[PDB]
């Protein structure tokens, strides 16, 4: 088989500038008919894989010509001029010179942008959930940059680690920020023993954590 190798990440680029993604084969992809059977596709966050370029030089339908591919021998580069926020995702090279086809490991395109503090929102358990005897307290830490962030939960001013589960998004296709959800799940009975539930976010944009709380007995 032909092994197709790419780096998992490129260096982060600023909006409007050019990006490169490199791909290596073990073997030439140039056939005796003069055509190089290299193709590139993209998988964007939460979408299905999209063909970009095939036979080295042919753009797929819908693909803008700021995407180009060049190379020779074992070495190819996908160039994306004037990078846009929506370009973020994982770019794959592949070959269809031979059977079987073989695929690269993908390179994630990362965008560099201005720091942004998280927007923090906390939500009590729904009446519906409580009726079933569960109680999930949810916190969103939304649209922040850079990607590094810490979340802590406190119940009556005392840190809580048990029952907390966190999920993080990939880089946003619209504004190049990151978000996270943190959910504290308890039984209805545990929930109803405390009143203050607190989500606190610590991010480089401030020395002080952003704190949101609600009080179960306030209203």
């Amino acid at each position: 088989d032909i092994v197709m190798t790419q780096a998992a990440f490129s260096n982060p680029v600023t909006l409007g500038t050019s990006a490169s993604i490199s791909c290596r084969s073990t073997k030439s992809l140039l056939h005796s008919n003069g055509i190089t059977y290299l193709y590139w596709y993209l998988q964007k966050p939460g979408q299905s894989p999209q063909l970009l370029i095939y036979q080295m030089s042919n753009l797929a339908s819908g693909v803008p010509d700021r995407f180009s591919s060049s190379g020779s021998g074992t070495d190819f580069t996908l160039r994306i001029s004037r990078v846009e926020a929506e370009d973020v995702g994982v770019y794959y090279c592949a070959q269809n010179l031979e059977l079987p086809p073989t695929f690269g490991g993908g390179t994630k395109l990362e965008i560099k942008r201005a720091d942004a503090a998280p927007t923090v929102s906390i939500f009590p358990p729904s009446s519906e959930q409580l009726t079933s005897g569960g109680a999930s307290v949810v916190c969103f830490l939304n649209n922040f940059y850079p990607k590094d962030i810490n979340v802590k939960w406190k119940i009556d001013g005392s840190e809580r680690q048990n029952g907390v589960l966190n999920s993080w998004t990939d880089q946003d296709s619209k504004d190049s920020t990151y978000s996270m959800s943190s959910t504290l799940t308890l039984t209805k009975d545990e929930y109803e023993r405390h009143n203050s539930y607190t989500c606190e976010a610590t991010h480089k944009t401030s020395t002080s954590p952003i704190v949101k709380s609600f009080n179960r007995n306030e209203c």
């Binding site: 042919n58 079987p100 993908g106 939500f123 949810v138 978000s179």
Partner: protein, 213 residues
């Protein structure tokens, strides 16, 4: 129009069989080398099978002797007969016309499991009671305790797309939980309503939740 459409995916016990099928608008399978490929999380796409226009079949070692690729030239249907299924065969399966301008479908999920499908419970996420502040308000829906992936959450029938975050699901004790958030102007929420609609195709359920109600 030109598209490939896979079907047949679902839950199947280890050791079982399952036949996938692929149909098309505008691609005549008999004319091309046709293939099946599969995608597992964070693993690279994996070729599964090919059949040439002349009917020569090809398989990698991972599936050879268990999977068989075949084609109905009259009805224009491509098949993958999966047999002796294994936990590691769990993946999104795509049919593909791999030569020329490559095409593939949307995919069909095959989950090799002893488990049964479980629909989600869907809970609204709205601010707690108290004084208001801010020109924007963030709302959500918690989609809890379902199996297998995936779910889709749609806000006011797609009318709020730009402002939405979809949080990747987490797996705990055999069940997934995910959430979705939307941010909207405070001038018009709660005065006007917002609804999340959650589809979980595996269990054939769609549930709508209104966010003040």
């Amino acid at each position: 129009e030109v598209k490939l459409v896979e079907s047949g995916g679902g839950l199947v016990k280890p050791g079982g069989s399952l036949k996938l099928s692929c149909t098309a608008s505008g691609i005549t399978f008999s004319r091309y080398i046709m293939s099946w490929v599969r995608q597992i999380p964070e693993k690279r796409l994996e070729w599964v099978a090919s059949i040439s226009s002349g009917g020569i079949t090809y398989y990698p070692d991972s599936v050879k002797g268990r999977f068989t690729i075949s084609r109905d030239n009259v009805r224009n249907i491509l098949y993958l007969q999966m047999s002796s299924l294994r936990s590691e065969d769990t993946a999104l399966y795509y049919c593909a016309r791999g030569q020329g301008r490559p095409y593939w479908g949307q995919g069909t999920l095959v989950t090799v499991s002893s488990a049964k499908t479980t629909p989600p419970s869907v809970y609204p996420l709205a601010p707690g009671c108290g004084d208001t502040t801010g020109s924007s308000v963030t709302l959500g829906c918690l989609v809890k305790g379902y199996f297998p992936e995936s779910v889709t959450v749609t806000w006011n029938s797609g009318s709020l797309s730009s402002s939405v975050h979809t949080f990747p699901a987490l797996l705990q004790s055999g069940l997934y939980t995910m959430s979705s958030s939307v941010t909207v102007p405070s001038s018009t929420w709660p005065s006007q309503t917002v609804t999340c609609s959650v589809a979980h195709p595996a269990s054939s359920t769609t549930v709508d939740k209104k966010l003040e109600p």
